[PDB]
Amino acid sequence: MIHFILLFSRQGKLRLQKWYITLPDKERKKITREIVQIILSRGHRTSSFVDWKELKLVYKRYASLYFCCAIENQDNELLTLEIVHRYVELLDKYFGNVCELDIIFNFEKAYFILDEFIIGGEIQETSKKIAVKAIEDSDMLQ
Amino acid sequence: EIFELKAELNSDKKEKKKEAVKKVIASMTVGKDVSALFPDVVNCMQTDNLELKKLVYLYLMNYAKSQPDMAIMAVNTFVKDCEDPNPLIRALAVRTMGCIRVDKITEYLCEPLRKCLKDEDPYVRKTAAVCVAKLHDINAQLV
Amino acid sequence: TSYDYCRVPMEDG
Amino acid sequence: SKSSVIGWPAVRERMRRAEPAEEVGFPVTPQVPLRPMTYKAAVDLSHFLKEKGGLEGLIHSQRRQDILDLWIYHTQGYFPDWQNYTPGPGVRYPLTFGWCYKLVPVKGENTSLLHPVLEWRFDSRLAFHHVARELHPEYFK
Amino acid sequence: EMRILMVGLDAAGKTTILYKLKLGEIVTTIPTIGFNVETVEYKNISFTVWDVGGLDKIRPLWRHYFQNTQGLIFVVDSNDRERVNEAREELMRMLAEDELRDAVLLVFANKQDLPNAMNAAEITDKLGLHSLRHRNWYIQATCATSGDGLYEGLDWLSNQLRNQK
Amino acid sequence: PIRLRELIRTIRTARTQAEEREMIQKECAAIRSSFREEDNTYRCRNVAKLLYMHMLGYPAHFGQLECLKLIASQKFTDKRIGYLGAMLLLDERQDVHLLMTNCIKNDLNHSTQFVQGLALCTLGCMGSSEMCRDLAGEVEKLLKTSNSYLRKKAALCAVHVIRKVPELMEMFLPATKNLLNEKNHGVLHTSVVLLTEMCERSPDMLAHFRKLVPQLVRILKNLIMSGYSPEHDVSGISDPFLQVRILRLLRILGRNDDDSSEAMNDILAQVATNTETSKNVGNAILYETVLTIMDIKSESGLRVLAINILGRFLLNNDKNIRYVALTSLLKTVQTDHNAVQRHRSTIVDCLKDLDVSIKRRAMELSFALVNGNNIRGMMKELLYFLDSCEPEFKADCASGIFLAAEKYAPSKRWHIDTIMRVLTTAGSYVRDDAVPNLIQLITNSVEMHAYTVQRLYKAILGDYSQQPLVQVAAWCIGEYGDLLVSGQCEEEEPIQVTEDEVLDILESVLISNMSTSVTRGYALTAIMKLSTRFTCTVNRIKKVVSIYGSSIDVELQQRAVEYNALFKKYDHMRSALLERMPVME
Amino acid sequence: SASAVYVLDLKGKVLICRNYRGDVDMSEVEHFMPILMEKEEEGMLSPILAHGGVRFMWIKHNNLYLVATSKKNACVSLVFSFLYKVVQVFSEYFKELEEESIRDNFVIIYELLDELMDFGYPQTTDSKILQEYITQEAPRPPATVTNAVSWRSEGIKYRKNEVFLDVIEAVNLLVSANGNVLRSEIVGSIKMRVFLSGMPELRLGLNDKVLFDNTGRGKSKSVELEDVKFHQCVRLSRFENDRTISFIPPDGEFELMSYRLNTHVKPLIWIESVIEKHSHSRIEYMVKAKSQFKRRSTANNVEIHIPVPNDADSPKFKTTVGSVKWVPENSEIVWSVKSFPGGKEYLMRAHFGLPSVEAEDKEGKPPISVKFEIPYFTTSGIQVRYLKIIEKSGYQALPWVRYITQNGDYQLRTQ
């Protein structure tokens, strides 16, 4: 179960939170501040995973933007990184040359892309074609 | 890149070596490891421009610890400039003398310090008084 | 300074 | 070249933020006399570019030229056809009689996630020995 | 616009003849720990002069000028026979370089007022100047206290710099 | 009203965060004022600009009602904005989110599947336990549909309501019956994750669900044998997301069964050999494959192969795989216990790795690797590794030293020796919670307290500032003081026990600021016991109790006065209750 | 006692670095900002930090962190007074002091760091005399640099001889929520603008109470200065004797003196405000502003800053005279009145709404600060009597003054 997802910049500037676990905003602002501090204080050969407080916290840098998940401590990890990468692919799919500044701008659909991909903390479409198809149709619905 | 900079640093024209040493302490301003070019800016130190000599004094003080052995290429130039009739250039050397911390150097500089202890202008004498404590900071018993 | 000045005496003996 | 100092880092930033690789019409500044970039002013400018710095060895391009030339016209009053150079074959020599700079060939987050050109050279005899005239004799009579 | 050096073992009067050429005076100078540099305008060629003293701690530090280096002057110390041998091993250390290749050799017979000083032929034969391939050398007798022999060596050096009328 | 990206561009020009807050409250007021206008036009964008500020971390409690208006809108984009911030601004404890319940229920009956997709999205992400109680029949109704766009969504939404309401899954036992033949993989994936959830909660559901184990053994074998599809394929590996979930469902099934464990045995022997271990994907396939084999009563030829799979994974230079391999043996500690023990030096190697998590998994698995055979040698590595821990691992190691030592200590003396070693070298890192445990085991120890209390005394003269160290000592001095100072009622030949510096070292704690006052709580307790445990020099210690009756700690002001009346009125009743404490477990 | 004085930015990268002893490592600066991130986010912020034995004395400019580092028991006020002086001298050189001022002008700024301080010992910090041999456009140092008179160079010559004084009042006020005045002191400050020829010794006299008590005129109008802090140039030993304000001024604008006194008379303008904060509903501010000061006097361009709630919305303002701007960016209202004479009393009735949902957290109570300015009006009643121009050449200067009364800290604690 993905407990939440964080996308924060090279400066730590969070471009996405998605709490699949219900914890209050002070706790949201506390925990988010810590893990950004944790990941930015972490090197490049540090196994792309953090065992953070009963959350095998998954991080995987792809660009200046950083990435974060909190998986349940009974689940898979490399696939959890592949979940990020499949979502990276879907961001690479729906955008193409997927890039930093419309993460800042067109984030609203990046949530919607996540809504077409992960609801509840888990995957609903294991295809990469059918999901971006559906969001285009709802975009074709406008 | 730095060699083209060292080409302009080993130039004979003033306007090329003046802009070269500005780029060095601008590279030092942006915090570049410009310590490798140490004894080469030392060649364009003994200059008639007093405005330029402060930049090298800025460099030599900053990279004295980095190049302690290469810092022996300034002792003659300090005792040269403790004697020029501008009191501005004498006290400028004196405060550059005491802040440069290489123990290979501080034994040689006590006499132009002693010279500037009994200088005339209040400007260098209030500068030379602190350089004693700078020397006593470096080598207390030599004082 | 849009406000104007006022002249004081010099000595006040 | 006094008011060309206040935009000397400002417009060059817009040049450097321009990639080297609404609006309609053309306004003219009222009552300001206009003249082309003359010889001695190009000597005044080539030394203004020699002294103020930040130009030599920079990646020249056409977008940077047009940012620069219109800014000269709107702030100094000079016809923005003076920064013309010889075309592709050969060294990009200036057609301008007095421009002592020839053109020899040589942000960061706008990049995507996973990825699925000239420069100046000072030549003070371009003001007298028009080398672009040697590259284009039949056009200059 | 051509540069020139003043190297060699110390206590040889080279900073004396430096400011004899620069000013024209016999100057009071410490044993030169760092270096000296001024320039001399003579025969319309700027004899820019680089002195480096001969202390032991500044013996390895001669290389830091050897980038962009066109001339050479070795100042012998012939009043010291016990130190002309280590100055000779100093000379073959300096002349065994592939970086100093355009530099013509220019020996100054200095301190020419003592009768123990040799001529311009014995010092040549003791040091082995003839065995120096790709080395255009010429020994020059320079008395420091008077100033004679200085500008004639600067004449031959000016014939080593330019090769014109 | 300006657009979103126009606002963001202004926000991207902000330098100081305080200056940025000025730009926030600039626009935020216009968002508020527009909300006072009850606008429906820019209510799309004003909420969108607000959610940005919410993502920027600003108090956007006020616009939440407008989100309910955007859910209760009629335009699709206003819904498309409205369902989003409902997942953002509202949670279960938001307490105003209950008004969605009618709105979602109408929009579970909306004509557009995408509107219903938005409704299943928002309820699936953050549907409240009572909202889950109020939408349960509608989700299974949208799970009884044929729209695979909705069947993929109502399945995971049904997981959510079973996650939120655990007593609700019994109406989904009929819902899940025989939809396991879905041609789509995504709906079939969500059904597996649902059947992962359904098998997770109730053991009573396992009987109905272990029946269809060979059904999916076929379908998983179909995934291996359909080696390519244009979708689902990453690096030549077809639908690995579904494949792991089947294995995880095959992990929780057959874990105490054998017939289903043999019904799944073949494809386990297949994909342990029929995987491409080149890319990250096939390792992720093979990792769960290892974990599936360990947790079921599997074929023994699988598990021997599986350690040989892991012996490869121990030696891959990918720290991912090293994190994977260390987690793997951290899982199957007890299961196939000795095939782990032959990989012991690999674990001691990863103590010297330069990653926190790798050193974390190695230290904890070393805490798991300790049997009664490696107890002597490995602790010497670990007590050395305790010296070579990070301060974050120093608290973690020193406790985990104490855990395995209480298990498999071959001696009671050597059990004391290592703990006394750790208490000297952990200090501020060893937790105070293990101190009653250490106190219990040394009074579970019955035989070496003359051995213990002297070594306790020999290190506390070194320091006191190690607070959990001197937590341990003061109870031992109070209880086993007779074994420290022995037969020394008067002055004798000087032995190291001297019954006055014994009393001074506790008095040194009482005045020292580096005392946790339960140090001083234990100390007066030790003072009052040594009125009885010592016959040597009492009533000089009464002075120390009597001067402490004006102390500033509340209980330690209680503790001294409650002692002192026994020291002043009931001197014979002092020893009448200072019998040693009983020993429990 | 400094060892290495650094300048950081809002990000913590070194704008400019300069050591004076070498006793603090140059890479110690990179721990400061995370410790600054540490101490602030735990609320343990102090102007001195410590990474082991390196002590981090710093001030904070608009962008800048003038971090002066040391290790020993350095003299602390020696550091920070120099820190505001370096800000001041840079403000004397660079009309704004930001990242553009540093990175474009490192030619002069490193020379300033060489000049202002040696070893940690500030020796020359008067910027006006420093302009004469440290230029951004070198000769010998001036004699005024050597001289005990270190603020005024000789040979300064003008066509006219103008002495421009600015007796400036600054009314502090602390009114509680009870409506009583807690603390209303007045910090007045006479700042001089001298345009004079040569080396004059100016001797000033006021309506000092003590000087009138020494004269025997302690029954007439005499201001009572509780403490003054003067310029260096005032010979304080001459002032200690007999209240004698005797000095050689520098040339140009400078604050000579800084007097401070308490005053048990009313505030010049009394404010009555109310708050009808209706829960989840709205808020109302029926605020009036009566002027207690003199009717001939007029409070120019007053700016009444009343802190409103953050989620306050739908503003309504029933003023009498003067406009309101609502500043949600400061979460407040500025009921601005340009001309507000003494004796006048203008009401303003504010009305917002409030969200029917509550907010998450508290806000606290900022007081109300207004921005009055009354010219030609000494509330303390200070009067310059004369100004003795004493020149060896001898001239008749033009001494001039104007009186301006403004707020100091004009806080009035709200409901």
Ligand SMILES: Nc1nc2c(ncn2[C@@H]2O[C@H](COP(=O)(O)OP(=O)(O)OP(=O)(O)O)[C@@H](O)[C@H]2O)c(=O)[nH]1
């Ligand atoms: N009698 C006599 N003494 C000389 C003559 N030339 C140089 N000397 C002596 O040699 C000493 C060395 O001269 P300097 O020029 O001061 O020192 P240097 O040879 O340059 O040695 P460094 O300073 O280390 O480079 C001087 O102190 C003179 O006394 C000379 O022509 N006649």
Ligand SMILES: [Mg+2]
């Ligand atoms: Mg010499």
